[PDB]
Every structure is written in structure tokens, then in C-alpha cells.
């Protein structure tokens, strides 16, 4: 049995060259044909092309002919997928898959390499409280949260009470705003009686911008 | 007793000229295809229509092991849908081929100081071979208007040329031994199976 | 150049029931030499690579449970899950590997179907802190509801707002098979302070009548 391991996350500006990689480890490698699949955000899979490492025999899909270059280096068991000039539309996650033959199912997959192409610069998030309404169902449950707004690139981590509180939490998927910056809100349901007695803090971490922020959410003075 | 005799096909001290290619039929034995792909001694191992990793638990009516010798530049030609000297006049594979084209540099075995000239290839032929066709005819090729009456000269050539396999030749002019595993499944009994 | 069409796009199925997905190929994918169709099925879950379930139209890849079975011939193929399990919530793609270029189906989204559950609705005014920065975000939360379809209408002084809002939805929950949804109304500090009543009107199959939660600016 063998496995494939891809290069890490990329974040580039339109016009930059890029070359992501896929190295295979395990016996039975001389046999494997290595293909590239693209998955755009929220979309399905699209087969881009396949290469044989042993002699660099390269077959493209019509949609990616001369839009990318699949290459290989049999000496290190590594397939490459490269652009000369990135467009913003190239923003996706790129899987390499492996079949032990040409006209063979893809048995083995890489973890995926996330590529983000955007004219946006690294920017740390701004954290705002979604304060619980004081006027809420007194015997039932109340909701409160954080708005993690205007950051780049993805991703951010949002935990609650330094990781203590996970029950009843929903961290929504980021949306790409028309500003090219991402934005996300994390909410939690807690007993309304606990609004006076328990401290609620959301912890936001944005590694790219080296931004660690703790925001206290409490019922608004108003 | 009945392991499939790939040992004597691959580790055979004599290989065949490509035009006069050797075909061993495989029947009535258990085939350990792991020995093959776990080997790190193969330049090429392009399989078509079937996964070597997934057939040491499948069965077939007949398996054929075709062996011969060509130069590195020409191993690319041992594949469905190719053209050239070797593909068209020596060893052709069908478009819907199912099997494995395994090759390795044999410069240590099939080269000599003054040039080894035992390995030949068909240079001329009136039409291309059909898939798995084997021509060993030494008919003088008629290139010109006037027919040769088995007489060699201007526009009338002996159809076989020799490989000039010298140790100091560049990779691609050096010899490579090739084995082509091909697999058929009819509605007859299956006799070639994996250990699983 | 072979093309595949999957159907349906979306498929909701109660726990322990049968799910069937159809792949229609524009052309046959039968290798003559071994009587086998060159058609594969993949499972893909959120944030994960696709996983090979079934190859040669009907052979199970090793370590695939019995409840997955593949079938069909010529151009009409089927992936079938008897006994849908919580862990089967995923997208399923068919792929032909008869000839390059290989091609995938558009994909089939598979959800757990459970009893209707109405959303708990909550509305959050913008923070004083955000208003200093000169934008205002009004958030509406629909919490733990099934199914996913719900109309969210923003109302600003009783005027329906349009195209200044984006929605966002959770993965179906592992334990209770519900979705949660956030509608986020975005406007300049200026435009925020022109109006009084910000309201969020939710229509959902589990609500006899559309529920509205609202707030008056500065309370
Ligand atoms: C002979 O071929 C077999 C493969 O069938 C292999 O196990 C062995 O290493 C070969 N002998 C050599 C390289 O001397």
C-alpha cells in the first residue's frame, strides 16, 4: 500500500507564478499514474490531467490544455502542477490522485492543496460581540456570539471560554465579501439564567496576521 | 509446484529480437504479481485497463508474456496508439489493450566492446502489422518501380537492420529488455489466478 | 470525450433507509477483453479528499462496508446505500475511466431526513464598537431546524431590504441532523442611523405562520 502528500496552502496575487507538488511514498510506486483534480469553493470535482512519472507522458483535459503544466520528477516520486501567471478564477483546492494504471480508478488521494488567488493583502480580523438581548424567554435559552469581520486570508479559529465551552456552539463558514475580505460569525445557545453568572468570551486566532484576540460578550448596557 | 513461471520469462538469460518477439502463454498456475511491482529494478511499468495491485485476487482464461529487446528511445512505442519503426513493423498493441508494459536498461547484459549486433528490427514493410502480428519473413523489400527477383541493391533492401549496442552509447541507444503482460477473459474456465 | 450526468442533485433519506444515485454516460464504457464497465464511485465529506468506494461499476474497494453496492451496464449505472448511516452524509460523484479525458458527474448531495423542526430565531443589533468603524452588521440566527429551505426577509422601517445581505449555513449536525443559518444585513453607519425598526422575518415549513424578531435602534 502507498500514499500521496501535497505541498501546503498557497495565497498568491493575480499574475504570480505557482508550482504545487505531490510526492508519493510506499512500495509499488513505479506503477502509479498521478492525476490532478480541481474543486472550486462549493463546486464539484473537475479532472485536469494525468502524468506517468517514469517517462513524463502527460494527458490534459480539454478545459486545462495550455492553461496549466503537469510535470514530474521520477527521482523523488513527485508530480508537479504549475501556472506561469495566476488568475483570481484559479482559486480552488487541488487534489492529486493516483491510479496504478492508465485507465484505472484513482485508488489513492492527496490531502489537497488550497490555493487562494486574490489582490487582497493579509489583514487581521476585527471581532465584535453579538450581545444577547436582555429581553429574552426567561425560562428558555438565549443566544450570543462574535462577528469575525474583514480578514484575509482564510482561515480563523474561533473557540469559547478558552476552549472550555463547545456545547451549543455554531461557527458558520466564512463568506467572501465584495471587499475581497472574509467574514464569519460564531454563535452559542446558553441558559438565559446563566447570563448574569457566567463569563462568555470568544477567542479568535488569525495565524497569518499573527492576531490573537479575546472578546467578552455580555448583555448590552444600552 | 504451480507458481506462474514469470521467473524464467523475466530472468531469462536470452531475450528475443523485437521483429521475432517471443510470447510465453501462461495457464494453470497461481501468479504473484506483487514480485513484479515491488521490484525497484524497472525503468517503465505502464499498465493499461488493469491495476497490477488489484489482480493477485482476480482470474483470467489466458495471460500472455511477450518478451523482446529494443533501445530506450523506442520503449515509448510499446503502447496502444503509437507509430514508428517498432510500433508499425515489429510489435503493435491494440487500441483497447489490457495489460502491463514493463521495461529496464540491460546495457550490462546486451552490450559488447565492438558492438552487439544479435538484436535486429524490421526496417521496411509494405503495410503496418495488425495487433500481436509477428513477421519473421526475410523478403527483399521492393522500394522502386522495378521488381527485385530476390536480388538486393538500388531500391531493393534486406528488410532487417541490426541494433549497434555499444556500452558507451547514450541512454536511449542502449538496450532495454521489455515484457508485455496481456490478459483475456472469455466464457471458458479461468486457470490464471492470484493467491487471494 | 465522454460526459456523465448524475441524478438527483440532492437526496434526503431517513436513518436506515435506502438511497439510490443514478449515473447516465453519454457513451458505453465496456472493455471487450474483460467484460467490465470502466465506471467508479467516490464519496467526499466536508474538508476531506474524495474516497474510492466502488470501481468496475460494481466491485467494492477494500475496507468498504457491505451496505454500498454498485450496478448497471452500458450507459445506466447506480450506486445504492441500503441502511443510510449518520456517517454517510456526503457528496457522491461517479467517474468514468474508460478513456482520457476522465470525467466526473456533477455530484449528488446526500442528507439525513428527519422530522420537521422549526428554527429558534434571534436577531443581533450591531455593536457600538463596529459603529465607530463606520459600518453596521445586523445578524439574524436561525438555530437547529430541518429541512434546510427557509425564507429570511430583512425589514427596515417595514421596507423589505434586498441584495445587502448574505446567508451562511452549518453542515447537517452529527447528533440531531439539523442545520443552523446566519443572515447578515450590512449597511453604512449613515444608512443604519436613518431608520428605527430592524426586523428579521423567517418562513420555514415547521412554522404555521412566519416568525419576526426585531429591535428599535438604541435600546
Ligand atoms: C529474478 O526475477 C525475480 C522476479 O520474478 C526476482 O525476485 C529476482 O530478484 C530476480 N533475480 C535477480 C535480480 O538476480
Numbering used by the authors:
A (entry chain HHH): 1 to 222
B (entry chain EEE): 333 to 528
C (entry chain LLL): 1 to 219
Show the paper's wording.
A new form of viral pneumonia caused by the coronavirus named SARS-CoV-2 was first reported in Wuhan China at the end of 2019 and has since been declared a pandemic by the World Health Organization. It is believed that the virus targets the ACE2 receptor on the surface of human cells. The X-ray structure of the complex between the Receptor Binding Domain (RBD) of the viral spike glycoprotein SARS-CoV-2 and the ACE2 human receptor has been solved and the surface used by the two proteins to interact identified. An antiviral molecule that binds to the RDB of the SARS-CoV-2 spike protein and inhibits its interaction with the human ACE2 receptor could become a valuable tool in the fight against the virus.
